[PDB]
């Protein structure tokens, strides 16, 4: 082909790297509050109010993050809380990991549009796999309900 198009801007790459760094920093922040052996964080707002919490959405929205990528991750956690109510930390860590991988993907010389479509394909395949692993459950089975509730409360 030859030399090809010359990237005159270099500023979009800087913006992408900054956004990814912010998201990865947010994930590393809320990374230690995951699982039954996780711990809670104490957050003090502008006033004297003190919050001790393990909920990822509460941790994210309680502290002002000042970065657009971090704010979008906070909105992501809020949306996950709305639709699901738990797994608010896992989704944020997943997004941070995805963007961290996107760092090396972009550095390898891949346009940030092939990455998006490939991520969509991977998401569809992963949805298929997760549905394959799923097991049917009915509300009449109290043991499964109790196990789910206990698993939810294990990390608090």
């Amino acid at each position: 082909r030859g030399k090809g198009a010359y990237q005159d801007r270099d500023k979009p790459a800087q913006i992408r790297f900054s956004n990814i760094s912010a998201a990865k920093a947010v994930a590393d922040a809320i990374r230690t509050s995951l699982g039954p052996k996780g711990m809670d964080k104490m957050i003090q707002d502008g006033k004297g109010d003190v919050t001790i919490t393990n909920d990822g959405a509460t941790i994210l929205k309680q502290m002002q993050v000042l970065h657009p990528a971090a704010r979008m991750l906070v909105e992501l956690s809020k949306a996950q809380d709305i639709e699901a109510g738990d797994g608010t930390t896992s989704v944020v860590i997943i997004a941070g990991s995805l963007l961290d991988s996107c760092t090396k993907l972009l550095q390898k010389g891949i346009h940030p549009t092939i990455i998006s479509e490939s991520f969509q394909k991977a998401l569809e395949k992963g949805i298929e796999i997760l549905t394959d692993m799923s097991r049917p459950v009915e509300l009449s089975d109290r043991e499964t309900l109790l196990n789910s509730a206990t698993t939810s409360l294990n990390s608090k």
Partner: protein, 104 residues
């Protein structure tokens, strides 16, 4: 399974799907972490056991190792993992389609 699917593909999309799978490996590493286990060895044992066909093999913090977890009663509904994956992928796709910041 996504590593296998990436191996079934070709071009830059194979690399992107490989990165996707390697990013999905982060949560198991974090679960191995925070519990005193060795993350690398625990994650490798998870991968090996799942390759052997153990679909329900997971991190067992009670015994400080790896075992079946359906006997440990550690389950969550599907519309937690599915929702998290879908929302995270959509957010990442939205973030990737950004190339400038303007101060209002």
């Amino acid at each position: 399974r996504l590593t296998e699917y990436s191996r079934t593909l070709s071009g830059m999309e194979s690399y992107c799907v490989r990165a996707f799978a390697d990013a999905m490996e982060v949560i198991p590493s974090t679960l191995a972490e925070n519990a005193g286990l060795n993350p690398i060895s625990t994650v490798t044992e998870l991968r090996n056991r799942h390759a052997q066909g153990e679909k329900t093999a997971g991190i067992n913090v009670r015994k400080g190792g790896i075992s079946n977890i359906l006997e440990e009663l550690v389950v969550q509904p599907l519309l937690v993992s599915v929702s998290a994956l879908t929302l995270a992928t959509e957010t990442v796709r939205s973030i990737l389609k950004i190339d400038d910041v303007v101060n209002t």
